[PDB]
Design a protein around this ligand. Structure first.
Ligand SMILES: [K+]
Ligand SMILES: [K+]
Ligand SMILES: [K+]
Ligand SMILES: [K+]
Ligand SMILES: [Mg+2]
Ligand SMILES: [Mg+2]
Ligand SMILES: [Mg+2]
Ligand SMILES: [Mg+2]
Ligand SMILES: [Mg+2]
Ligand SMILES: [Mg+2]
Ligand SMILES: [Mg+2]
Ligand SMILES: [Mg+2]
Ligand SMILES: [Mg+2]
Ligand SMILES: [Mg+2]
Ligand SMILES: [Mg+2]
Ligand SMILES: [Mg+2]
Ligand code: NA
Lengths: 48, 77, 90, 55
RNA sequence: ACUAUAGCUUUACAUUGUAUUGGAUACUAACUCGCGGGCGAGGACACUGUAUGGUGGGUAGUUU
RNA sequence: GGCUCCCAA
RNA sequence: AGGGUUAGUCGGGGCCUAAGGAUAAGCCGAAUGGCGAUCCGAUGGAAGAACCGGUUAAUAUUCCGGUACUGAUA
RNA sequence: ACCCUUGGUCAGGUUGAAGGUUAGGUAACACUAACUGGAGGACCGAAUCGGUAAGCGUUGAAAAGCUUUCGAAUGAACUG
RNA sequence: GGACACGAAUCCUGUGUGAAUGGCGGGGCCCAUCCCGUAAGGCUAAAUACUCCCGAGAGACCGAUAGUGAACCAGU
RNA sequence: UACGAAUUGAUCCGCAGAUAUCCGAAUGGGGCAACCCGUCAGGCCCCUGACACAUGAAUUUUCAUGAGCGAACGCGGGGAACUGAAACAUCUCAUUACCCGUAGGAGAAGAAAACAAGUGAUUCCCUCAGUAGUGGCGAGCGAACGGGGAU
């Protein structure tokens, strides 16, 4: 049975990466909210 | 950003009011158009996006004076 | 000073007992072969023939405190196997 | 529209005079085609002065 | 079903002017389109703004 | 593989 | 806890473009913005260039010995 | 789910369309015979895609499965 | 059409018009008298609002399932 | 734990300096943030360290200014619905929530084409007053003049 999560690093960074968040105004809104909450990880670019 | 370059007029927000006083949001739009003008002082042709009220002011006080007044009022740019 | 420390290990001892013109250094991860070569010439007054490099990432480790557990990492480094000209040692 | 006349105009004479016309007839025809110019106060004063220097 | 409404559509004013025996014709200069990098075709119409009358389960809020 | 045939080219 | 992954020739990238994306000149639009041909963008095109034998507890067309090739530079 | 660009895959066996050649036959076509040929949302059947019927499972090995059976398998195919 | 306490005097304007130079405007529909003021140019402190932060203090506020989600490895 | 520094004045405290890798408005060009690839002037020597190389607005290519982030308070541009009216459409919720733009230490307002039936620019507090009004005259909403103060 195929499950919902099928990993792909290129797709992950294209969809949720730091540059894609910075591209639009609402992505920068998301980044500002996460910084205000104080999250240790800001985007999926942080994980390794 | 469709604004009359001579008068500065822009679209207004108002209501459609039915007979039963139902109120619906609406826009009053400017009677706006692009027109080509002969500028006599510089002997040139200038295309202006203006309203009919702006055209009335131009026909009243001349195109050069209207352009100068609009520039001093900040409408022209 | 890109060179951090020499490599003392069984593999390095075996390769030096075999060839005797080969020496292993641990250097900064961003130093390429030309600068590793010039640096070892400066630090030891020898002529260098060839350089082989490999990048190591740090090992992941488990720091143990009184209450629980923390996840940490060691620093990354670069290995540099250095071949001197036939006749010289370190 | 109030216009000083600059050249001769058919069906509307009075060269070098003050005349009223429809705004389109004069914004789209005369002023673009050189004859006539809008009679602002400065141009009215200059025209009156030229008339007094002629007379 | 009741009330609105996007859209479509009618007329008036503005954009919008000139002549002839008014409401028709004609004109070109506003305005629109094509070609080439001015020329051709239209033309005071068309288009758009304001107002107005129709149509409007396409859409919405409700009642029963 | 050239080559032959075909049309959906 | 200590050790272990070695490349001019292997793979990738550096070069090129597709869908698409971001934009220039311009266009549209209460604002935030939306369009719009050069650039980006592989899943495709181009890539210059070997090997037989040994060898570790753990690497090998990468280390060692023989046979070569390929590109710059003086 | 659908679409766009660019790649890949489909053991083996069967059947025998168009067409071609050589005979007869025609005024010429027509029209019969043999061989050849290898078409097809053609046939049987692995990989593969799907999910017909039955059995098992139902605090299951599994938040939809397994075994047997069954459909398609050069295409309106499957797949990265 | 909108804002004004106000669901059509005052103020604003999408659309179409359009003066005056003692004149004009206002006093809740409209006229006259009376009274008040002088539009279509601009600037201006104080008394007013708030606390990310720094310093000094306080509480008939809590005392580890309370008090901030977080007294500790906490936006972990 | 070692090993060192320190009365020739360490460590520590106050003020002033030096250095300050990479990403990020990121600004030499790209990019999958913390990476890849360059040009021109020099200096070393295929490779290195140190310069410069963005865009928009005043401006005359020399020059200053801006971009981004960030508590609340201010001003402005858009702007709901649940709810209440014991249903619901005018009305209410509310010129609220929310989105967007943009200042300052405060901002906005402010010196009568004013209120009134004598006062004399703004702002804020207490009253006037739940009054005058307004409203399917329902649910509700709700002033101003005057007086007392801060300034
Ligand atoms: K080597
Ligand atoms: K390597
Ligand atoms: K499969
Ligand atoms: K101020
Ligand atoms: Mg372990
Ligand atoms: Mg319905
Ligand atoms: Mg409702
Ligand atoms: Mg390219
Ligand atoms: Mg590829
Ligand atoms: Mg192995
Ligand atoms: Mg078949
Ligand atoms: Mg099968
Ligand atoms: Mg089959
Ligand atoms: Mg707690
Ligand atoms: Mg850039
Ligand atoms: Mg109700
Ligand atoms: Na850069």
């Amino acid at each position: 049975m195929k499950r919902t999560y099928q990993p792909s690093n290129r797709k992950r960074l294209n969809k949720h990466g730091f540059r894609s968040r910075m591209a639009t105004a609402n992505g920068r809104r998301v980044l500002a909210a996460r910084r205000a909450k104080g999250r240790a990880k800001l985007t999926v670019s942080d994980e390794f | 950003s469709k604004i009359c370059q001579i008068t500065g007029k822009k679209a207004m927000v108002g209501n459609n009011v039915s007979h039963s006083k139902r109120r619906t949001k609406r826009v009053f739009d400017v009677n706006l158009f692009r027109k080509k003008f002969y500028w006599v002082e510089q002997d040139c042709w200038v295309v202006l996006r203006i309203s009919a009220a702006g055209l009335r002011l131009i026909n009243k006080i001349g195109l050069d004076a209207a352009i100068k007044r609009a520039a001093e009022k900040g409408f022209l740019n | 000073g890109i060179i951090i420390k020499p490599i003392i290990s069984e593999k390095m001892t075996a390769v030096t007992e075999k060839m005797s013109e080969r020496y292993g250094f641990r250097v900064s991860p961003n130093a390429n072969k030309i600068e590793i070569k010039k640096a070892v010439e400066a630090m030891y007054n020898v002529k260098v023939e060839d350089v082989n490099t490999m990048r190591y990432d740090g090992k992941r480790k488990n720091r143990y405190t009184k209450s629980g557990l923390i996840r940490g990492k060691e620093a990354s480094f670069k290995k540099a196997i250095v071949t001197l000209k036939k006749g010289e040692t370190i | 529209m109030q216009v000083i006349l600059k050249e001769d105009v058919v069906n509307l004479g009075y060269k070098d005079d003050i005349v009223t016309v429809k705004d389109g007839y004069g914004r789209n025809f005369l002023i673009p085609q050189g004859k006539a110019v809008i009679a602002s106060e400065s141009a009215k004063k200059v025209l009156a002065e030229n008339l007094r220097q002629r007379a």
